[PDB]
Each structure stands twice: as structure tokens, then as C-alpha cells.
């Protein structure tokens, strides 16, 4: 079984006016279909940085990141066709409704938006009957979960979840990471899930812990 994502020996360095900051340091990661690898670490250890190159949101200062079965494609088309993002904050488009937050992804992927899949994904994340809400009529955790629902609308093979339960009561957190695990296995996804709720490791195949930009 070949890996879905190879982060081969990869680093991120930022200019600090004069000096530098090594956000991520020689990351080596390989994730195979059906795997859900939790990511853990103290605030500001490289967790989001690792997801951002894993997501082709930026090229790594060094090393390479390769999604397989998408070799021979540009970064953007890769994201569009093969990756799902649960952004660290909800990043909802402020003029759409809850339902539209998801449909717009069908749209930009070039297919007629499926009003009914949207409604179902909205229900799984615990938001049935809220698909008409404007962003400003949603709570923080409600938003997180539209954000989550949006990630699940496509047919990706890599799923990147950046602390997707941060705003959820324990009950719902369990449901979410349960859902993540399920669609990971049902669909043989490679899933990277950042979290601080170390309890949730229970649902993860393996896990990478991070300090000072490195894996341990």
C-alpha cells in the first residue's frame, strides 16, 4: 500500500525582520489510506505549520511534499481535487448561509451544488435545521462544525483537521472525532488531525507529538 501523502524532510522558516523563526524543522511524515494520525504539541510548536504544507497552502522552505495520484498537478488543483481542510478558525464566507458554505465547494469544483448532501452533512455535525443561518446567527461551536461539514463535502483523499473540536463541549467533541474516524475508514482517507484533547488519541491510528518545530 503506497502512501497518500509524503512530507519528505520538510522545513518552514520565516523572516523575523532581522533574524529568523524556524516554524517547522525537517518534518518527515508519511500517511497511508485509512490512517488517522493525530497531531499534538504545545501552543506554537509547529502543528499548524505542518498542516499548511501538508495542505499545499505554502511551499516548504526546504524538502518536498508530494500527494500521490495528484503528481502532475499544480498546488491549487491539488487542493481543489484531493484535499479537505478544517481550518483552525472557521473561515466562513460572510454572505453565505450554513448550507451555502458547503455548496460553494461543489460550485468551485465545477459541479451542480447538491442541496441534499449539504443538508445531510449539516445534520451529522449536529446542525439539522440550521442550514439557513447567516454566519452572525451561529455560535462559535456551530461555526466550527459548518467548517467541519464543509471539509466533508468533496471526494478528497487527504483530510487535514486543525483542532476541530476546540469550541465543542465534550459530548460533541466525541461525536466529531468519531465522525472523522468513521469517514476516514469508510473511505480509506489519510487524515491528519491536530488536537489538544489528548483523550481523543483513542480514535487515532498513530500520532505525532511536536515541540520546537520538530516531531518526536
Amino acid at each position: 500500500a503506497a502512501p497518500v501523502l509524503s512530507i519528505t524532510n520538510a522545513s518552514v522558516v520565516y523572516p523575523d525582520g532581522i533574524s529568523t523563526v524556524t516554524a517547522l524543522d525537517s518534518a518527515n511524515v508519511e500517511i497511508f489510506p485509512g490512517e488517522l494520525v493525530a497531531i499534538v504539541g504545545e501552543s506554537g510548536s509547529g502543528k499548524s505549520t505542518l498542516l499548511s504544507i501538508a495542505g499545499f497552502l505554502q511551499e516548504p522552505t526546504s524538502g518536498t511534499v508530494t500527494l500521490h495520484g495528484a503528481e502532475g498537478l499544480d498546488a491549487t488543483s491539488t487542493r481543489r481535487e484531493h484535499i479537505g481542510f478544517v481550518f483552525q478558525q472557521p473561515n466562513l464566507l460572510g454572505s453565505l448561509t450554513a448550507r451555502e458554505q458547503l455548496l460553494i465547494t461543489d460550485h468551485l469544483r465545477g459541479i451542480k451544488p447538491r442541496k441534499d448532501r449539504a443538508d445531510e452533512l449539516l445534520a451529522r455535525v449536529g446542525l439539522k435545521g440550521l442550514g439557513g443561518r447567516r454566519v452572525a446567527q451561529l455560535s462559535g461551536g456551530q461555526r466550527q462544525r459548518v467548517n467541519i461539514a464543509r471539509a466533508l463535502m468533496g471526494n478528497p483523499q487527504l483530510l487535514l483537521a486543525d483542532e476541530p473540536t476546540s469550541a465543542l463541549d465534550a459530548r460533541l467533541s466525541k461525536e466529531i472525532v468519531e465522525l472523522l474516524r468513521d469517514v476516514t475508514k469508510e473511505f480509506a482517507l489519510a487524515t491528519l488531525m491536530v488536537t489538544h484533547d489528548r483523550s481523543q488519541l483513542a480514535y487515532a491510528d498513530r500520532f505525532v507529538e511536536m515541540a520546537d518545530g520538530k516531531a518526536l
Binding site: 499548511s52 495542505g55 497552502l57 505554502q58 511551499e59 498546488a75 491549487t76 488543483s77 491539488t78 487542493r79 481543489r80 481535487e81 484535499i83 481542510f85 481550518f87 473561515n91 464566507l93 460572510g94 454572505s95 453565505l96 451555502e100 455548496l103 460553494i104 465547494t105 460550485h107 468551485l108 469544483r109 451544488p113 464543509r150
Partner: protein, 344 residues
Amino acid sequence: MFLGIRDIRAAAGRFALIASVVGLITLLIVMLTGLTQGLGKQNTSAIEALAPHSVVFTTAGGSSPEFTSSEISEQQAERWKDSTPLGVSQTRIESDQNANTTAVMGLPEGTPLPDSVGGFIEQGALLPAELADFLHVRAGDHITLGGATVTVAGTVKTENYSHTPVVWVDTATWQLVSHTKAVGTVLLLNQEPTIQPQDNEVVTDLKGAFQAMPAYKSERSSLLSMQAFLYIISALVTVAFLTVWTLQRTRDIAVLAALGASKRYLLIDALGQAAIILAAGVALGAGIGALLGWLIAGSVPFSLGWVSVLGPALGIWLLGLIGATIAVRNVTKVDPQIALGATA
């Protein structure tokens, strides 16, 4: 343009406000353009009104024909058939109660005048009503016109030559008033010239005939200057404005980019949206122009055609699309991660 179009329902006030500034600009253009096409007709409306296809002049030095320095001999008038001889002079007109300088055009008796002016060339003098008022004369009175006594045959409307209203008189009277044997200053051709000109003759299209008016040239500079700074400063101000507008979309565009939106996709969205708001604003500004303009032709000169309103409108709509393009190209140029640094 899934997102672009729903931005508009989500915030119809914000977009009205932006269509306003685009419309207000189209207004300012459609207005000033026609106010300056106005001053321009203050030299040209009278020969315009006479609608000649070609107009044969006369120079001997092979030089640029000039309305001040050309004349048609009574025999010249036959080497061109289907032609009418027009006399153009500027002379003093004098009533008992006042005086002024004024343009005098001569046509052969019975020549029907432009409906812009109305009537027929009678014997004697046909005065713009505004000129008759100024002089305090009526049909039947006597005026001195170039030192000759002439009878006011009647009044008419006002077309213009070199910044004065034209007094319409018959060839013989124009000959008297301008002190010349010539039957006119130029010949008016309604069809096309089925003959060729001598070494000392020269046909002009009605566009060129303006070149022969001495006041036209020494001004055409000052009007094109306005017509130019208007379009320059404007197009720049538009391109700039649509740029700072579309730039309020960086965040939503950056999110869309991260999710995988192709740059064509995002350009289409941003253009399709601006398209709608621009189209609304030019349509609205070109409408209030025409109307508010047609509603002001007197007490103010204001010429405005259809390449003169639909002309700019298609120009702002085209330029506003550009300014949006500058903004989207700017966001989509960079790695989505950095753009989400704008997001806060």
C-alpha cells in the same frame, strides 16, 4: 459566480453606494462632454445645420482653404452643377437703439433653410429672434448691416458662426453688405462631386470645412484639452477605485483560493460581480445624463449624441472590469497561506 452574486443580496446598501460613485462618474463625463460639444457648436452649428456633403472653397496659393479668404465668382457657380453658393461674412449690425457684430450668411432667394432655423431665404434680412430683441426691431423695420440699409424680412431661430447668431440674407443683399461682386464664399454640394477642381479650387468634407473657420481652430485646442484630461483622470480614477473596491474581497477570495478555487474561477467571480454593479452604475449615470441634459438645452448649449453617452458608459464598464482584474490578480498571485495573513 456563486459567492459574487450573493454578496450583492447580502449587502445591497454597500453596492448601491458603489454604483453611485460609478454612476456619478458616468454623469460627470456625459455632462461635461455635452457641455463642451456645446461650446463647439458655437462656431459650427450654422454650416452643420445646412448639411452639405462636400463644400468647394477657393485658394490661389494652394493653401489651406479659409472662410475669410475665399470667394465664388458668378461663373465659378456654373462649373459646379447641383451646387448652391453660400456667403459668409461677419459685419456690424446697427438698429436705432443698439448695435453689435454678427455673422451674415447669404443664400439665393427661396433657398429653404434648415429646419434648425426654419423658413425660406426671403429678400432682405432674417434675424435671430434673440438678435431682433437685442436690437429692439421687428419684421418690417430697417437696420444698417455693413453700412447698407436692409429690411428685416422676419425672424428665425438661432444657428451660429464664429460665436454669433447668423442673420440670413439673399445673395444680392449679402453682396451689398459684404461689398463684393462674388456670389458667395463657398459652394454647398448635397450629393458627391461629379467633377474635379482647378489648380485654385479645393473640395472639403464638412469635417474639413471647420478647419477653414478661424475661430474653430484657435479653440479646438482648448476643447480637446478638456475632452482629454476628462477621460484620462477619469479612467485612472475608475481603475483605481474598482481596485480598492475588489480589494475588500481579499479575505473571502483567500479562503476560496485555499479551498482550491482556480484563478479563472476567482477572476470570473470578481468580474461577473463588478460587471453587474458597473452596468447598473453606468446605465444609471448615462440615463440621468441624457434626461438631465435634454432638460437643460437652453438656457445652455448642450450637444449630445449616442456615441456620446453609450460611448463613455461602455468605457467605464470596460475600465472598471480592469480595476477589479488588478485586485484579483493581486490576491491570487500569492500562496494562499500568506493571503490568509490578511484574514484576521
